[PDB]
Design a protein around this ligand. Structure first.
Ligand SMILES: [Mg+2]
Ligand SMILES: [Mg+2]
Ligand SMILES: [Mg+2]
Ligand SMILES: [Mg+2]
Ligand SMILES: [Mg+2]
Ligand SMILES: [Mg+2]
Ligand SMILES: [Mg+2]
Ligand SMILES: [Mg+2]
Ligand SMILES: [Mg+2]
Ligand SMILES: [Mg+2]
Ligand SMILES: [Mg+2]
Lengths: 154, 215, 305, 53
RNA sequence: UUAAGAGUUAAACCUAGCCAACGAUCCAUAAUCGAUAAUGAAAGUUAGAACGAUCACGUUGACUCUGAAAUAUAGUCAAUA
């Protein structure tokens, strides 16, 4: 769901503007993969499963009985009076989905504007969806995998 | 879950011992993972210091080495596995002792055997009200194993002109608790448990002022 | 803001005062005369520093800023001069301190406004003969001659060819007296290349910068990964920069045709492939266009490609 | 005309052989590369992981 | 009928459909295009003179013969001069 991912991107920007250390996002496979990619890339300090009330201290198993009250809790990073995660935007919008082949992805990573997408920036992460796996654009290039260019985060 | 967890605090790297049921007893898997990851951190230019702590925060930091397996590796004559175990543990101790970046050890809880080895070789070792420090190898037919015979003759403050207080601690295996460990020099700082969170944030923030040399 | 600015000298000079109604003079002309000094009956300016060529392998480039635009000297004693109030040329009242301690880099700088233009070093005939002998007789590869003498390889090959031409000309007594005097006066004007010095020997590790690399690209990786020149070369899809130096240091079927007595030309047929050979149909015509292709024949005649 | 017809036959069959070899050489080079991006790198110890979750 | 499908053209019978506000029908305007030319950072925009490709026409309209292929710059009839 790109609408929910857009909501998460905007919510992360909102939480970085006010400098809250911990916030929540919807509990879904796409949301969890996105948060994990941010966490492994150093944009998030922590990623926990939890409820609508807070992160879970101990493991709580997710079932249809509690699926509606699950959340993913993410810790935001700040350093030198600046947020680490300043901007977070979608490339492939719900009303214009952008699927690129590996060659155009390499062009985008090499400074070429492809389909009006500004190229990758020095400290930016572009995520790509392939076979319902979110992954870094450079990783998709290494694996020679075409995919949907999903979002930028800087 | 993995027996050791590695996390990040904005410049510091946090290593959490993650075996609560066995009181963070140290293994060869644990020692190898810690040794390799510290080798990685020694090269990183975005790492400033390492924090050593435990998830089982109040009760134990590291309740010795897991020498029961070492004893079963010798009841079944698998002496090579015991050799690997001690090689990993002592190479890790040697790494921690000679590390060129600050290492900070939170000795919040029981600290024995391998725990002393993890904590005694760093200039920054923090005791709390919960610190229960001991060296109980004499009663299991074993020796001070983790470089304690090197450290204690040097770091202990009182009655240690000829290593005799170090000998008392080693031979008797007396449990030294809390501020007594700080006063004897077994711990370098004394911080209440409730503060160790805030300290952990602070240690994650400070960087060298300029020329970015954390060594 | 901009107006026309007559290029008066930037340094002080004595301007015209009251002028006889028929002088018809300009301040620029007087400035040039003062710069040049008096002209002989032979049409010479002996008093100007730059009139005569140097002889000690130290180029005599202009220094209008160091010497305050005072270009006059005694031709024999080489001591500075200045124009006194009475129209004579005499010693300066005070001595310049900017003309004695001149940075050695400035002495090889032809133009005072361009620090990046420097004269090259002439090679002595002995060194050129040494290189020619090494390459042609001892058969040493140009790479090791370049390394030994600190000269770029194309320069070494050019030296070989030029020395060969010189040898032919000397064998034919074509180098006249005037040519030898011109060559030796030119040779004594420039600094002499010194093989031994580290700062006078050419850098031997230069490669062209291709367009592909010029764009800055950045990779975010785990904090401890090694990333060397080979990994960078892989990322940019190029050979590593060392094979570029290594490679810079270093079939079609044809049918010749039957010639018979009286035939003025021969046919050679080079094998080709349909879809690649031929003049294309509806190709761009540039003859009326500003970028029309001009080439030169094997006889040097300008032709239209 | 026989030479042209038979050389064309030969060229087509040779092209098919070459394309099969190219496919089975790429299918090996690609797998070698994917696997060589599976050798555990020591630096991977510095990437934060939450494998259990 | 045609070498050949088809309301293509001719004849008969039926069914009541078909297109259209994502623009039908009607009207006006225009030969069309390129690895051609112009322009621009580029997407594009412009031209369609030159080079090349395709179409249509040879004063206007319809028909016919021959022919593999023609409503042919042919022939017949008519119009205009
Ligand atoms: Mg003006
Ligand atoms: Mg029909
Ligand atoms: Mg009908
Ligand atoms: Mg209409
Ligand atoms: Mg028209
Ligand atoms: Mg048009
Ligand atoms: Mg035309
Ligand atoms: Mg024309
Ligand atoms: Mg016609
Ligand atoms: Mg006419
Ligand atoms: Mg007509």
């Amino acid at each position: 769901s790109l609408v929910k991912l857009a909501n998460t991107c905007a919510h992360l920007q909102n939480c970085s503007k006010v400098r809250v250390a911990l916030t929540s996002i919807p509990y879904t496979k796409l949301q969890l993969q996105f948060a994990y990619n941010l966490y492994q890339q150093g944009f998030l300090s922590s990623l926990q499963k939890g409820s609508t009330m807070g992160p879970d201290k101990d493991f709580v198993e997710v079932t249809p009985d509690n699926i509606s009250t699950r959340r993913l809790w993410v810790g935001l990073k700040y350093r030198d009076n600046k947020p680490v995660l300043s901007s977070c935007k979608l490339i492939s919008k719900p009303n214009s989905r952008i699927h690129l082949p590996m060659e155009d992805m390499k062009k985008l990573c090499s400074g070429v504007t492809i389909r009006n997408i500004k190229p990758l920036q020095p400290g930016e992460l572009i995520l790509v969806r392939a076979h319902n796996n979110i992954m870094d654009i450079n990783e998709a290039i290494s694996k020679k995998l075409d995919g949907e260019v999903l979002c930028r985060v800087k | 879950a993995p027996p050791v967890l590695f996390t990040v605090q904005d410049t510091a790297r946090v290593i959490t011992l993650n075996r609560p049921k066995k009181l963070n007893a140290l293994n060869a898997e644990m020692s190898e993972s810690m040794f390799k990851t510290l080798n990685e951190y020694a090269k990183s230019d975005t790492t400033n210091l390492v924090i050593l702590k435990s998830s089982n925060r109040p009760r134990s930091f590291c309740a010795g080495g897991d020498v029961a397996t070492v004893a079963i590796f010798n009841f079944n004559k698998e002496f090579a596995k015991s050799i690997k175990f001690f090689t990993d543990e002592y190479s890790l101790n040697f790494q921690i002792a000679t590390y060129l970046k600050p290492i900070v050890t939170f000795m919040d809880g029981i600290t024995m055997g391998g725990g002393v080895g993890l904590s005694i070789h760093t200039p920054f070792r923090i005791a709390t009200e919960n610190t229960k420090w001991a060296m109980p190898e004499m009663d299991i037919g074993f020796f001070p194993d983790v470089g304690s015979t090197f450290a204690l003759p040097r770091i202990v403050t009182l009655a240690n002109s000829n290593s005799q207080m170090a000998l008392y601690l080693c031979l008797t295996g007396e449990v030294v608790t809390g501020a007594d460990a700080y006063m004897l020099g077994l711990a370098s700082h004394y911080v209440s448990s409730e503060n160790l969170d805030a300290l952990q944030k602070r240690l994650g923030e400070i960087s060298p002022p300029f020329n970015n040399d954390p060594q | 803001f901009s107006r026309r600015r007559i290029a008066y000298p930037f340094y002080p000079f004595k301007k015209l005062g009251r002028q006889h109604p028929k002088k018809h003079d300009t301040n620029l002309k007087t400035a040039m005369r003062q710069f040049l000094g008096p002209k002989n009956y032979k049409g010479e300016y002996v008093m100007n520093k730059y009139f005569t060529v140097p002889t000690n392998h130290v180029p005599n480039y202009i220094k209008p800023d160091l010497e305050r635009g005072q270009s006059l000297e005694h031709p024999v004693t080489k001591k500075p001069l200045q124009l006194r109030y009475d129209g004579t040329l005499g010693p300066p009242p005070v001595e310049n301190k900017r003309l004695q301690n001149i940075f050695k880099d400035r002495l090889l700088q032809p133009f005072p406004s361009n620090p990046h233009c420097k004269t090259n070093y002439v090679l002595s005939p002995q060194l050129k003969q040494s290189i020619f002998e090494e390459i042609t007789v001892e058969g040493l590869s140009a790479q090791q001659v370049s390394q030994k003498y600190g000269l770029k390889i194309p320069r070494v090959e050019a030296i070989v060819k030029l020395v060969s031409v010189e040898n032919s000309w000397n064998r034919r007594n074509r180098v006249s007296s005037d040519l030898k005097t011109m060559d030796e006066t030119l040779y004594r004007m420039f600094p002499v290349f010194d093989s031994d010095a580290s700062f006078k020997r050419e850098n031997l590790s230069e490669i062209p910068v291709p367009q592909k690399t010029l764009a800055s690209r950045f990779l975010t990786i785990a904090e401890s990964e090694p990333f060397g020149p080979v990994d960078a070369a892989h990322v940019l899809e190029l050979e590593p920069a060392v094979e570029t130096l290594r490679n810079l240091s270093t079939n079609t079927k044809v049918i010749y045709g039957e010639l018979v007595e009286g035939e003025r030309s021969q046919y050679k047929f080079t094998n080709a492939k349909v879809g690649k050979v031929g003049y294309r149909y509806g190709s761009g015509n540039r003859d009326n266009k500003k970028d029309r292709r001009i080439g030169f024949n094997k006889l040097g005649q300008m032709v239209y490609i | 005309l026989i030479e042209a017809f038979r050389k064309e036959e030969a060229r087509l069959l040779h092209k098919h052989e070459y394309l099969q070899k190219r496919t089975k050489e790429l299918e090996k080079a690609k797998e070698l590369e994917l696997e060589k991006l599976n050798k555990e790198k020591s630096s991977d110890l510095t990437i934060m992981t939450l494998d259990k979750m």
